[PDB]
Amino acid sequence: NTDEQVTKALNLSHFVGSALVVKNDHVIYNRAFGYANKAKNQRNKVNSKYQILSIQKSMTAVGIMQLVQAGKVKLTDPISKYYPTLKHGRQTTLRQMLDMTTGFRLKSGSKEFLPENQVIDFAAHNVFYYPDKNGIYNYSSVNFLLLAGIIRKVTGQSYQHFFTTHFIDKLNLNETGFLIHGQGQDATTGYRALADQTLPNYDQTMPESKSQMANELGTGQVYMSTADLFTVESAILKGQLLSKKNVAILHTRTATGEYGGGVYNMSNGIRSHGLGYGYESSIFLSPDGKTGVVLMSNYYRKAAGIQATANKIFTELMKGD
Numbered sequence: 234n235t236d237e238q239v240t241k242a243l244n245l246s247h248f249v250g251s252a253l254v255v256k257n258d259h260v261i262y263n264r265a266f267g268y269a270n271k272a273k274n275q276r277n278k279v280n281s282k283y284q285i286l287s288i289q290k291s292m293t294a295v296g297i298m299q300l301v302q303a304g305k306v307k308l309t310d311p312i313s314k315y316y317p318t319l320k321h322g323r324q325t326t327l328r329q330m331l332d333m334t335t336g337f338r339l340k341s342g343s344k345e346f347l348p349e350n351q352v353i354d355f356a357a358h359n360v361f362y363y364p365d366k367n368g369i370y371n372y373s374s375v376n377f378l379l380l381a382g383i384i385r386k387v388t389g390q391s392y393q394h395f396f397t398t399h400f401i402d403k404l405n406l407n408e409t410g411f412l413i414h415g416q417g418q419d420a421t422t423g424y425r426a427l428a429d430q431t432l433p434n435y436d437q438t439m440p441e442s443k444s445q446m447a448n449e450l451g452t453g454q455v456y457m458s459t460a461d462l463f464t465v466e467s468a469i470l471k472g473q474l475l476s477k478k479n480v481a482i483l484h485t486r487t488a489t490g491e492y493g494g495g496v497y498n499m500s501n502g503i504r505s506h507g508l509g510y511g512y513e514s515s516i517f518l519s520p521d522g523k524t525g526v527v528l529m530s531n532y533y534r535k536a537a538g539i540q541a542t543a544n545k546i547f548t549e550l551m552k553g554d
């Protein structure tokens with residue numbers, strides 16, 4: 234039985250968070266573990282809200298490809314079309330930004346709590362360009378912040394507004410929003426772990442400021458339940474937000490990396506992973522969007538990482554075990 238096997242693996246790995254497994258469009262596992270907030274004696278629930286972290290980049294990527302489908306941008310466009318003040322790397326294409334094949338990097342945003350337009354301005358003013366990284370896979374979050382700025386510039390909407398109408402409203406997500414406004418009901422607290430810690434003790438929480446949340450524009454500012462994250466990623470692969478032809482164009486790997494169009498592309502599906510602020514998020518999904526695994530945790534432990542567990546579940550699920 235799948236329930237028995239997955240529960241055993243999650244308990245032996247000391248999982249804290251919510252787990253969802255879907256096979257051929259049917260939920261076969263949906264269970265929560267540990268505490269959303271230990272001091273308040275609030276257990277994690279299947280509908281608890283967790284940080285999606287870098288998995289948000291897959292959504293920013295779809296937003297760019299929606300603009301391509303609508304004739305409003307092209308993947309061959311150079312970044313300098315939208316950021317004319319850049320002094321270097323001006324030829325970098327939107328394609329490369331989506332694939333993490335650029336030389337742009339920004340290790341920190343402003344220490345102030347800024348509105349979106351000023352977060353974009355700060356990044357454009359302060360980003361650095363490494364020519365030796367151009368054209369080769371290297372993970373750099375600023376690419377997706379700058380892509381969120383392109384969404385804003387082309388549409389005349391905030392990224393938050395665009396995300397809300399294109400994902401939250403479109404797919405009737407009821408456990409999704411922006412951390413900066415509060416999670417609301419069924420919220421979770423992120424816990425800080427020691428490097429070698431495997432057992433949860435809830436002895437320290439992980440802080441995150443409004444500045445840090447604003448600076449995650451396009452890149453890791455959203456909370457979701459496991460169900461809402463599955464819904465978004467499956468809807469993308471099913472053609473509900475973007476033609477399947479354009480999903481395939483977007484989700485194309487490069488010569489130097491599986492990453493392309495905001496996800497890692499494999500022979501048997503896609504994967505995305507997030508880590509930050511005490512959280513870890515993991516999705517593996519089949520090419521048709523009908524079979525996959527979502528694990529989200531508010532208690533990240535390097536010595537008990539959840540991606541390896543999700544990878545094992547996914548591999549077995551795709552075989553038939």
Ligand SMILES: O=P(O)(O)OC[C@H](O)CO
Nearest residue numbers: 286287372506507508509
């Ligand atoms: O995005 P990955 O693949 O580097 O995994 C860790 C994330 O960057 C953090 O959110």
